A paper describes a structure:
The simplest description of the gating cycle in the pore domain of a K+ channel requires at least four distinct kinetic states. However, as a consequence of allosteric coupling between the inner gate and the pore helix near the selectivity filter, opening of the activation gate in many channels leads to a series of structural changes at the selectivity filter that renders it non-conductive (the O/I state), a process known as C-type inactivation. In an attempt to increase the resolution of pore domain states where the inner helix bundle gate is open, a set of cysteine-bridges between adjacent subunits was engineered, using the lower resolution structure of KcsA-OM as a template. This experimental approach, combined with targeted mutations known to affect the stability of the C-type inactivated conformation, allowed the structural determination of KcsA in its ‘transient’ open-conductive (O/O, mutant E71A) and deep C-type inactivated (O/I, mutant Y82A) conformations at near atomic resolutions (2.25 Å and 2.4 Å, respectively). Trapping KcsA in its open conformation has allowed the development of an atomic description of its O/O and O/I kinetic states.
Incorporating the non-inactivating mutation E71A on the Locked-open-KcsA scaffold would lead to an efficient sampling of the elusive O/O state. As predicted, the E71A mutant on the Locked-open channel background displayed a pH-independent high-open probability single- channel activity, albeit showing discernible subconductance states (attributed to an incomplete cross-linking of the activation gate). The O/O state electron-density map validated the inter-subunit disulfide bond between positions 28 and 118. In the O/O state the activation gate spans 22 Å in diameter (Cα-Cα distance at Thr 112), in agreement with the more physiologically relevant open conformation found in the full-length structures of KcsA and Kv1.2 channels. As expected, in the O/O state the selectivity filter shows 4 K+ ions in the canonical 1,3 and 2,4 configurations, together with three more K+ ions, two at the extracellular entrance and one inside the channel’s central cavity. At the present resolution, there were identified four water molecules coordinating the K+ ion in the central cavity, consistent with the coordination of a partially dehydrated ion about to enter the selectivity filter. Superimposing the selectivity filter structures of KcsA C/O and O/O states confirms the conformational equivalence of these structures within 0.26 Å RMSD (for selectivity filter atoms). The normalized B-factors of the pore helix residues (Cα) in the O/O and the C/O states were very similar and displayed similar periodic behavior but largely digress from each other within the selectivity filter residues. Clearly, the structure of the Locked-open KcsA-E71A mutant represents a snapshot of the pore domain of a K+ channel only transiently available during normal gating cycle operation.
Author numbering:
A (entry chain B): 1 to 212
B (entry chain C), D (entry chain C): 26 to 121
C (entry chain A), F (entry chain A): 1 to 219
E (entry chain B): 1 to 106
C-alpha cells in the first residue's frame, strides 16, 4: 500500500506570504493525488484534484504541483481562514490512502486578551451549583496563564480550563477558565477574581466582582 | 451500412461494460491500478484493438475473466468495424 | 442542499454493536462509491472501506482489524456501516464520502461521533452568562452560555440560530466524572444589547434535545 | 457451427499446454516471473489474442519457444473463433 | 534473487495485545508473499497466502496486509499458542526465497 | 492423514552419501511440485530445490553449493533427494513440501534429521523418575523419565501414547562424549497416580527402537 509522507507536520507562516505543503509517496503514483482541507470541527473539503486541477468554489490562491512521488499544495498569500489541517490522498493503486496531515499556523501580531468574568446564573444557583466563568479572548501568542482568587487568596481547586485552536477568523487564541463550587461554598465568600498574565503586559489583566 | 452500425454499438457496449466490471473486479486487490472508470475505459479500448500497451491490466482472476470477454467480444466487434471501413475505402478506389 | 446526511452521535456500550447511516441526495450514478473514513480525536483520516450501491460489493482496509460491515439500500439511497463488538479504540468520528469512481472524495458527510462507554446519556443544562452589575461597558459587550453535565459528545452551539457567526468562540469540552462541560462566548456591539435579542441554541443529538436560552441583563 | 466448436477446443488446449510448459521452461531462470500456472494461463491468453500487455513474458530460450508455439497455433485458433463469431453476427444483421 | 528482511528478529509482547511482524522485499513482488508459523520442534505451517488470504483451520486472529515491498503479518490478541518463529516467503520470481524469521515472545 | 511421509533420521559418515525419501499421499495433480528445505539447528529455512514429478525436471538453489540430486517415482508417489559427499555443515533437518504450482507450500513433511558423524548408532537407556519416599504430595504430582546415552538425534517422548499432552516438558538433549541425554517431565493430579497408569514412550528412529517404561512408586 502507498504510504504518503507529509513533512513537516506543522507549518508556521506570516500572513500574506507564500506557503507550500509537501506530500511524498512511497512509489510513483503519476498525478493521482488529491488535497483536502479540514478546519477545526469541520468535515474535509476537496481543494485540488489530480495534483493540480482546481475545484469550483475554491479560492484561486490554492494551487498544486508535482508528479511521480513528490507533490506540493501551495497557497499564495495565506489568510486566517486557511488555518486548518491539510491532507493528501492517492487513488493510483488500491486501496486509497491518506497522508498524515500538515497543520498550518499563522504568525500574527501580538494581541492582549479581552477578559470578562461572569458570576453564576440565577437558574444555576437555584439547584445547588455555582460556576464562575472567565473568558480570555482573542490574544496572541497562545501562551497565557490564568489565576483565580477568592477574597484575595489564590484558589486552585475546582478550576477547569479549556483552550481553542487558532481562530480561523483573526489568527488569535482564546481560553475559558471555570471555577465550580457548591452554592454554599460560593455563598461563604465575597470577592471573585480571575487574573490573566500574558506577554502583552507585565501587569496582569484583572477582572473581579463582589457577590455582596 | 446498417450492419457496420450494429457492430459499432456492440463494441461501445463491450467497452463500457468491460470498464465497469473491471473496476468492480479489481478494487479490493492491493496494488491493482485498474480501479477508476476513465482509465478502465482506456484499458478496454487498448485490449479490444489488440494494441495492449500494458500501462494498465487486471491482476485479479475475475478482472482477467472480464478481460477475456473484452478480448473475445471486443476484438471480434472491432474487427467487424475495421472490415466495414476497409470495404468502404476499397469502393472509392474503384470510383476513383 | 446537504448531499450526505449522517446522524450526529451514537453511544454504544463496550462489546455492543451499532449501525451508522449515510443518506445520499443530489445526483446519483451507477459509478458512485460510498466510502467510510474514521478519525479519532487529534488524529488523521483513516480509510475503512467502500461499497458500490449499484451492485452491493464492498471492500475493506486490510491493514486494520475488520470491525465493519457495509451495506446499501438503493430505494432509500442510504448506505450503512455495521460496527460490531466495539472497544474504546473504536470511539471516533465516522465520515461517509461519495466518490464518482474517479478516485477523489468530492463530498463528505458531517460525520457521526461514536463513543464507546458504559456511562449513560445525559442532556446538558444550559445557563446564561450575562455581565455583572459592576462590569464596565466598552464599545463591545461579551455574553455567553454555560453547557454543563452532558454525555456523550457532541453538542452544537449557535447564536441567534446562526445569524450571529462573527465574534463567537465555543471552547472544547472538558470531561468530569463521566460528564462534559463547555462554554460559548459571543461579542456584539454594546449599543445593540439588550435592545436586540441575543439567544444561544444548544443541540445535543445523542439525547435528541435542543434548547434555547436568551441572555438578558441581571435584574 | 461444428467447426467453430473444434477451434475453441484447440485454443483451450494450446492455452493450457502453453501455461504448463511455460512454467516448466521458466523455473530455474533467476528473475523469471512466468513461474506459476494461474498467471501463466493469463500470459498464454494475452499472447494468443495478440494483446501482449507484457506484465508477463518468458525469459528463457525454451520459454520463448513455447511462446512461439502459442503464437502460431493460438493466434490461428483464436482467429478462427473470432471469424466464426463475426460470421454469426453478420447473419442477424441480414435477419434484422 | 529476492531478499526478504524480517526486522525485528524478536518480538516481545504482553498477552492479549496486538502484534505485527514486518517483512520487506528487496524489490516489488506484488502480493506474492506467504507466511508460515513454526513451533519448537515442529514443521512450518502455512498461515496466510498471497499477503492477506486466510487459510482454512487458521484462527481468525491472524491476518496479513501489504503489497509491493512492505508486508505485515498481524495477530489480534496474542496467546501462548502463538509463541513460535514466523517466516515469510515470496513466489514472485525464481527462485522462491524465505525471510530470516521473527521470534514471538510473550 | 499425513500427506508427506519422511524418515525420522539418517546417520551418515563424513564424505559419504545418503538418499532421503518423501512419500506423498492425498490428492496428486500434474501441476504438483515437491520442494526440499534445509534447516540447521537454531537457523532459518533454506530452499534447496524442487522437482515436478509429472515430468521429472528439477531445479536447484544457485546461491549454495550443489550437494543434492532430486528424483521422483510416480508409481510409489515418492520423491527422493540424494545428498552426496557430506560434511558437518550438512547436518540439518531436511523438510519436503508440496506446492500446487501456485507458489506456496500448503503441506510439509515432518522432516528428516541428518547427522554427519563418525560415531556409531546407539539406542537410549530409559529410566523412570518417581518421587522419593520423603517427597510431600501437593494437589499435583510430577513424574519423569531419563533418556540417556543415545546417538544420533532425535528421540520422541510421549506419555500414555499421546493421551497425556498437557503438563509435559521434554528438555533439549545435551551431548556428552558422542552421546546425548535428555529428560521428560509430566504432571498429573496426585489423586490419579498410581491408581491410573502413567507410562512414557521413547522412540529412537535412527536405531529403529521404541521402548515403554511405566512409572511406579518406589518400593
Ligand atoms: C460506467 C462508466 C464506465 C465508463 C466511464 C468513462 C468516463 C470517461 C470520462 C473521462 C473524464 C476525464 C478523466 C480524467 O480526468 O483523467 C485523465 C487524466 O488522468 C484521464 O482520462 C482518461 O482516462 C481518458 C478516458 C478514456 C479514453 C477514451 C476512449 C473512448 C472510446
Ligand atoms: C496444468 C494447469 C495449467 C492451468 C491452471 C490454471 C489455474 C487457474 C485457476 C486460478 C486460481 C486463482 C489464482 C490466484 O489466486 O491468484 C490471482 C491473484 O493473484 C490471479 O489469478 C489469475 O492468474 C487468473 C487465472 C487465469 C486467467 C483466466 C484465463 C481463462 C482463459
Ligand atoms: C470480484 C467481483 C466479481 C465481478 C465479476 C463481474 C462478472 C464478470 C464476468 O466475466
Ligand atoms: C527447460 C525445459 C524445457 C521444456 C520445454 C518443453 C517443450 C517445449 C516445446 O516447444
Amino acid at each position: 500500500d502507498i504510504l504518503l509522507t507529509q513533512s513537516p507536520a506543522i507549518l508556521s507562516v506570516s500572513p500574506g506570504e507564500r506557503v507550500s505543503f509537501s506530500c511524498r509517496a512511497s512509489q510513483s503514483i503519476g498525478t493521482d493525488i488529491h488535497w483536502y482541507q479540514q478546519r477545526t470541527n469541520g468535515s474535509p473539503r476537496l481543494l485540488i484534484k489530480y495534483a493540480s486541477e482546481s475545484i469550483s468554489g475554491i479560492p484561486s490562491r490554492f494551487s498544486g504541483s508535482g508528479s511521480g512521488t513528490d507533490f506540493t499544495l501551495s497557497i499564495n498569500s495565506v489568510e486566517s481562514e486557511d488555518i486548518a489541517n491539510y491532507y493528501c490522498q492517492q487513488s493510483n493503486r488500491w486501496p486509497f490512502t491518506f497522508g498524515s496531515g500538515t497543520k498550518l499556523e499563522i504568525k500574527r501580531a501580538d494581541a492582549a486578551p479581552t477578559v470578562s468574568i461572569f458570576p453564576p446564573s440565577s437558574e444555576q444557583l437555584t439547584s445547588g451549583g455555582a460556576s464562575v466563568v472567565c473568558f480570555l479572548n482573542n490574544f496572541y501568542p497562545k501562551d497565557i496563564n490564568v489565576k483565580w482568587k477568592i477574597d484575595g487568596s489564590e484558589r486552585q481547586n475546582g478550576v477547569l480550563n479549556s483552550w481553542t485552536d487558532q481562530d480561523s477568523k483573526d489568527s488569535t487564541y482564546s481560553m475559558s477558565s471555570t471555577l465550580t463550587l457548591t452554592k454554599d461554598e460560593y455563598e461563604r465568600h465575597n470577592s471573585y477574581t480571575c487574573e490573566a498574565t500574558h506577554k502583552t503586559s507585565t501587569s496582569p489583566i484583572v477582572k473581579s466582582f463582589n457577590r455582596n | 451500412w446498417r450492419c457496420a452500425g450494429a457492430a459499432t454499438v456492440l463494441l461501445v457496449i463491450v467497452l463500457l461494460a468491460g470498464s465497469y466490471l473491471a473496476v468492480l473486479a479489481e478494487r479490493g486487490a492491493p496494488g491493482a491500478q485498474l480501479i477508476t472508470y476513465p482509465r478502465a475505459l482506456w484499458w478496454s479500448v487498448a485490449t479490444a484493438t489488440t494494441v495492449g500497451y500494458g500501462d494498465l491490466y487486471p491482476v485479479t482472476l475475475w478482472g482477467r475473466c472480464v478481460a477475456v470477454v473484452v478480448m473475445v467480444a471486443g476484438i471480434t466487434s472491432f474487427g467487424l468495424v475495421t472490415a466495414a471501413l476497409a470495404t468502404w475505402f476499397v469502393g472509392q478506389c474503384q470510383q476513383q | 442542499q446537504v448531499q450526505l446526511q449522517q446522524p450526529g452521535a451514537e453511544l454504544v456500550k463496550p462489546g455492543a454493536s451499532v449501525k451508522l447511516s449515510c443518506k445520499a441526495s443530489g445526483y446519483t450514478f451507477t459509478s458512485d462509491w460510498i466510502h467510510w473514513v474514521k478519525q479519532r480525536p487529534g488524529h488523521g483520516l483513516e480509510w475503512i472501506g467502500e461499497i458500490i450501491p449499484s451492485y452491493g460489493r464492498a471492500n475493506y482496509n486490510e491493514k486494520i482489524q475488520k470491525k465493519a460491515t457495509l451495506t446499501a439500500d438503493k430505494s432509500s439511497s442510504t448506505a450503512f456501516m455495521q460496527l460490531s463488538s466495539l472497544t474504546s479504540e473504536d470511539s471516533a468520528v465516522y465520515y461517509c464520502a461519495r466518490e464518482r469512481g474517479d478516485g477523489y472524495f468530492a463530498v463528505w458527510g458531517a460525520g457521526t461521533t461514536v463513543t464507546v462507554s458504559s456511562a449513560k446519556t445525559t442532556p446538558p443544562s444550559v445557563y446564561p452568562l450575562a455581565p455583572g452589575s459592576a462590569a464596565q461597558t466598552n464599545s463591545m459587550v461579551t455574553l455567553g452560555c454555560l453547557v454543563k453535565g452532558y454525555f456523550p459528545e457532541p453538542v452544537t452551539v449557535t447564536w441567534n440560530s446562526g445569524s450571529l457567526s462573527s465574534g463567537v468562540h465555543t471552547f472544547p469540552a472538558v470531561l468530569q466524572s463521566d460528564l462534559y462541560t463547555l462554554s460559548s462566548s459571543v461579542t456584539v456591539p454594546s449599543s445593540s444589547w439588550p435592545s436586540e435579542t441575543v439567544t444561544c441554541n444548544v443541540a445535543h443529538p445523542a439525547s435528541s434535545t435542543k434548547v434555547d436560552k436568551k441572555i438578558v441583563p441581571r435584574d
